[PDB]
Amino acid sequence: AQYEDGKQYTTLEKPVAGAPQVLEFFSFFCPHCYQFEEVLHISDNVKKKLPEGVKMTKYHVNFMGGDLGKDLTQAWAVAMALGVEDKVTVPLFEGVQKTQTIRSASDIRDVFINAGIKGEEYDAAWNSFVVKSLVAQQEKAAADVQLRGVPAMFVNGKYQLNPQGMDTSNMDVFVQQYADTVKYLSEK
Numbered sequence: 377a378q379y380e381d382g383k384q385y386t387t388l389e390k391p392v393a394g395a396p397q398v399l400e401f402f403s404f405f406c407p408h409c410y411q412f413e414e415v416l417h418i419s420d421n422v423k424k425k426l427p428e429g430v431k432m433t434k435y436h437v438n439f440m441g442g443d444l445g446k447d448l449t450q451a452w453a454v455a456m457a458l459g460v461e462d463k464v465t466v467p468l469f470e471g472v473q474k475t476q477t478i479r480s481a482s483d484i485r486d487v488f489i490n491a492g493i494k495g496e497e498y499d500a501a502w503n504s505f506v507v508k509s510l511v512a513q514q515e516k517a518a519a520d521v522q523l524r525g526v527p528a529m530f531v532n533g534k535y536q537l538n539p540q541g542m543d544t545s546n547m548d549v550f551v552q553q554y555a556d557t558v559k560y561l562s563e564k
Contacts, residue, residue, distance in 0.1 A: 383541045384557045388534055392520045395533030396433035398426065398558065401518060404448050404472045405441040406526045413469055416551050418527075425555045426562060434461070435514040437526055441472075447481045448472075453510035454488070454501045463491040531561040 381387050400419060402409040412418040423432055436452035438445050448468070455461045467487045471478035478484060488498050501507055521530055529537040542553045 379557065379560050383538065384553070385531075385538045385561060386536045388521065388530075388536060390522075392530075392533035395517070395520070395530065397430050397532055397562070398422065398432045399517060399521075399530040399533070400432070400434040401437050401523060401526045401528040401530075402434065403437050403440040403445065403526050404468050404478075405445060407473065409527045410469050410473050412527050413465060416547060418551060418554060421551050421555045422529075422558050425559045427559070430562065433517075435517055437518050437523065438515065439524070440526070444472075444479070444481075447484055449514055450502065450507065450511050451481075451484045451488075453507045453514065454498065456510055457501050457504070457507055458493060458497070460488070460491065460493060463493075464488055467491060529558065531558060531564075535561045535564070537561075 379385070402412070419432065419434065426432070436449040438449055441448065451464075451468070452461075455464050464487055467490065468478070468484070471483065471487055478487070485495075485498060485502075489495060521533070521536075527539075531537075537554065537557060539550075539554060542550055542557075544550050
């Protein structure tokens with residue numbers, strides 16, 4: 377076929393019931409994730425090709441960057457609760473990987489403050505039980521699906537994007553192939 381199991385995607389031996397339709401995992405410490413976000417705009421190009429009625433979910437993971445890694449998962453939970461993903465994603469990536477000015481929870485907080493979220497609003501979110509369960513959701517989703525690497529994308533709890541098998545001579549062509557694959561899997 378043109379799309380084949382084991383080439384543009386892999387199938388999960390152990391499917392996950394009730395998962396979000398399009399589930400993406402990343403880490404602010406993950407260099408390909410940085411590419412995916414700021415150079416390729418993968419999430420965005422996928423959305424643009426998804427049928428609609430389809431929800432996109434993106435979660436942070438713990439297994440990179442130790443203590444800071446966890447702080448970042450809680451901060452992403454804050455970002456999701458407040459709906460400010462689109463204001464902190466870029467400064468968090470660049471603060472971790474470009475300028476290396478993020479070294480403690482306090483520095484993570486500075487990024488939110490600078491993006492215009494109020495201190496009181498951030499600290500209350502940070503400490504809320506709603507953020508606790510949002511942290512729990514992120515961990516459970518990674519747990520359900522075998523996750524030992526990022527960037528990762530899962531479709532309908534059954535298929536896993538396999539980017540190793542798409543030509544990388546041209547970045548634009550890679551993204552489109554990637555996005556078209558998600559759509560195919562979406563319609564499967």
